[PDB]
Amino acid sequence: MADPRDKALQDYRKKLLEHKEIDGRLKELREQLKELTKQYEKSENDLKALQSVGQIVGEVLKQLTEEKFIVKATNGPRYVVGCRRQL
Amino acid sequence: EQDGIGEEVLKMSTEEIIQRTRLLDSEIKIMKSEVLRVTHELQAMKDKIK
């Protein structure tokens, strides 16, 4: 007759081994999630940054009125242009 | 692990029959549900990132 103490010890050891295996699986999944969260954050940032247009760089020569400025693009041409309100 | 060994030794029937088995079953069910949810979310997010 196997001792009940020995049976309980063997059952506890088997359950601990199964728990360790599932904990290893959970740790692998947690590492996967940790890496993929940052990877997806970077991918989302890249996608958001793709849809952004630049801005011409120029020099202000003179202000004609409140909402009218003379601006000289570095290319060479001079334009009469407006100004953003909260500026 | 010494505390666990002492418990499983001194209390062979008062803990293994009722306490240990139910705790292990509840834990295994909870972690299985968590693993399934995590796998589903990971698959969806991987499709999105692709």
- CB proximity list for A32: less than 8 A, separation 6 or greater: B42
Tell me the backbone φ, ψ of residue A66, rounded to 5 degrees. -65, -40
Integer-rounded Cα radius of gyration of chain A: 34
Q: Determine the Cα–Cα distance for residues B50 and B33; give it in Å rounded to an integer.
A: 26
Contact by Cβ (8 Å): A4, A12: no
Helices and strands in chain A, H and E counts: 1, 3
Residues on chain A touching B5 (C-beta within 8 angstroms):
9
B24/A15 CB distance under 8 A:
yes
- Residue B25 in tokens: 């079953």
Distances (CA, A) of A45 to A40, A52, A55: 8, 12, 20
Distances (CA, A) of A63 to A34, A70, A75, A78, A80: 54, 6, 20, 13, 9
In this structure, chain A runs to a length of 87
- Residue B34 in tokens: 């968590």
Chosen for mutation from B9, B10, B16, B45 (greatest number of chain A CBs closer than 10 Å) is B16
Tell me the backbone φ, ψ of residue A26, rounded to 5 degrees. -65, -35
Residue type for A33, please? L
The SS3 call for residue A37 is helix
Q: What is the structure's resolution, reported in angstroms to one decimal?
A: 2.8
Residues on chain A touching B49 (C-beta within 8 angstroms):
36, 39-40, 43
Q: Determine the Cα–Cα distance for residues B24 and A15; give it in Å rounded to an integer.
A: 8
CA A42 vs. chain centroid, Å, equals: 4
Contact by Cβ (8 Å): B3, B15: no
Contact by Cβ (8 Å): B7, A9: no
The SS3 call for residue B3 is helix
Contact by Cβ (8 Å): B49, A42: no
User: From the list A5, A29, A36, which residue is nearest B35 (CB)?
Assistant: A29
